[PDB]
Amino acid sequence: AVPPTYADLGKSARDVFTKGYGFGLIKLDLKTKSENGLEFTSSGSANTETTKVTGSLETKYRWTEYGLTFTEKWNTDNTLGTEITVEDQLARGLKLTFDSSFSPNTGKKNAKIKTGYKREHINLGCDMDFDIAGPSIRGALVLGYEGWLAGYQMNFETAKSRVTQSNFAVGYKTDEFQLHTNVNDGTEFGGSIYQKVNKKLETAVNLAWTAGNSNTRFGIAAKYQIDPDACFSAKVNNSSLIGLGYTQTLKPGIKLTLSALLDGKNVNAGGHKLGLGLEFQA
Amino acid sequence: DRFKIEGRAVVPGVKPQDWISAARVLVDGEEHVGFLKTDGSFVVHDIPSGSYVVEVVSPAYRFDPVRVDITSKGKMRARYVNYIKTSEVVRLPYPLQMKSSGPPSYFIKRESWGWTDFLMNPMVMMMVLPLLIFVLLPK
């Protein structure tokens, strides 16, 4: 039941590739849960290469009285964003999302409507983007029976012409084996496999192929937790890229993560990309 | 020593006699002034040596000024109007043939807000959810 959506389809492998290391960036997040319903998150990203300071304050209002969720975010470039989520209002698996962005300093507005239908094995989703440049409509439908799953994504724009962007993603998802192949307009061909040998060993393999210039690139990643608080991550790319990350829980909420990407050669040309991450949860 | 400059201006459409009304041409701006013929042509006499900019002045369809170089010997060389640069850009034949692009924009444009476009407001979208919820009740 509840088949995976298009964005979530394969998100395990990308998340393994994404989460774990943030070299070149400084991670600083604080999450706070209140007693009744209040959620507060303050995250701060610091860059040493570009010397940039980025951050967002995110306030979450979980209302189970009617299924309403109120989210308000604030960035550093004077951008204001509000979001309303309604789930299980009158239908079975209907979800309505309203996202709005407005700037007080200058004047700029953007709108986004998300709609989601979830059923026994049928997943429907429609995103309508309202902007001055041009409205766009994007629909993703996922169908599967037991383990065989296939999803279709389409993107259409009324501003220019009959532009249509096709996406066909076919995969096999089960308890410990997860394989997924994504096809973009018969041009992009991606294949991700992810498996778990034990409760401590995780392996992932990614392949990318194209029909235009016949470019092929593959990469493998391993994740292993020595202890419930100590974890290690390694990733190797096709050409020479190697990345190592190590995470350890220091205080019962405080965790420290270290990331290092090495690009070195033997012709006197080498480079290090380091990154520190630290978060607090309350 | 005095010379004469003649030229022909062709409108893309309308009527030549329609556009001749209230139409004059300037060589310096208040020094030498030329008048147009019945269909169209500016013929100016009583001119000395030097460089001058020929421009046809009209509240209607406008024209691009053209620089003209007059020599004492009797050579006539026409070029594009250049102020920042003072060299030869492009050389074209002498029989001035100006082609008016059209009516210059004298008034500015103000646009209203579209019905499909005003739905992007932070406030208008926060009312559409109550509107839909209240619509789904009687149905």
Swiss-Prot record, chain A:
PROSITE patterns: EUKARYOTIC_PORIN. The modification N6-acetyllysine is found at residues 19, 108, 251, 265. The chain crosses the membrane at residues 25-34, 38-46, 53-63, 68-75, 79-88, 94-103, 110-119, 122-129, 136-144, 149-157, 162-174, 177-184, 188-197, 201-210, 217-226, 230-237, 241-250, 253-262, 272-281. InterPro entries: Porin_dom_sf, Porin_Euk, Porin_Euk/Tom40. There is a cross-link at residues 11, 19, 52, 60, 108-109, 160, 265, 273 (Glycyl lysine isopeptide (Lys-Gly) (interchain with G-Cter in ubiquitin)). Pfam families: Porin_3. The modification Phosphoserine is found at residues 12, 192, 239. Changing residue 11 to R: PRKN-dependent polybiquitination is decreased, whereas PRKN-dependent monoubiquitination, mitochondrial calcium uptake and apoptosis are unaffected. It is a multi-pass membrane protein. Coiled coil: none annotated. GO terms for molecular function: ATP binding; ceramide binding; cholesterol binding; identical protein binding; oxysterol binding; phosphatidylcholine binding; porin activity; protein kinase binding. NAD(+) binds at residues 241-243, 259-263. The modification Phosphotyrosine is found at residue 66. Homodimer and homotrimer; in response to cyclic AMP or calcium; oligomerization is required for scramblase activity. Component of the mitochondrial permeability transition pore complex (mPTPC), at least composed of SPG7, VDAC1 and PPIF. Interacts with SPG7, NIPSNAP2 and SLC25A30. Interacts with hexokinases including HK1. The HK1-VDAC1 complex interacts with ATF2. Interacts with BCL2L1. Interacts with BAK1. Interacts with RTL10/BOP (via BH3 domain). Interacts with amyloid-beta and APP; induces VDAC1 dephosphorylation. Interacts with TMEM41B. Interacts with BCAP31. Belongs to the eukaryotic mitochondrial porin family. Consists mainly of a membrane-spanning beta-barrel formed by 19 beta-strands. The helical N-terminus folds back into the pore opening and plays a role in voltage-gated channel activity. PANTHER family: VOLTAGE-DEPENDENT ANION-SELECTIVE CHANNEL (PTHR11743), VOLTAGE-DEPENDENT ANION-SELECTIVE CHANNEL PROTEIN 1 (PTHR11743:SF13). This is Non-selective voltage-gated ion channel VDAC1.
Swiss-Prot record, chain B:
Its main location: endoplasmic reticulum. The keyword Membrane applies. The chain crosses the membrane at residues 118-138. One of its GO terms (biological process) is protein insertion into ER membrane by stop-transfer membrane-anchor sequence. It is a single-pass type I membrane protein. Part of the endoplasmic reticulum membrane protein complex (EMC) that enables the energy-independent insertion into endoplasmic reticulum membranes of newly synthesized membrane proteins. Preferentially accommodates proteins with transmembrane domains that are weakly hydrophobic or contain destabilizing features such as charged and aromatic residues. Involved in the cotranslational insertion of multi-pass membrane proteins in which stop-transfer membrane-anchor sequences become ER membrane spanning helices. Belongs to the EMC7 family. This is Endoplasmic reticulum membrane protein complex subunit 7. It comes from Homo sapiens. The gene is EMC7. The chain holds residues 43 to 181 of 242 of the full protein.
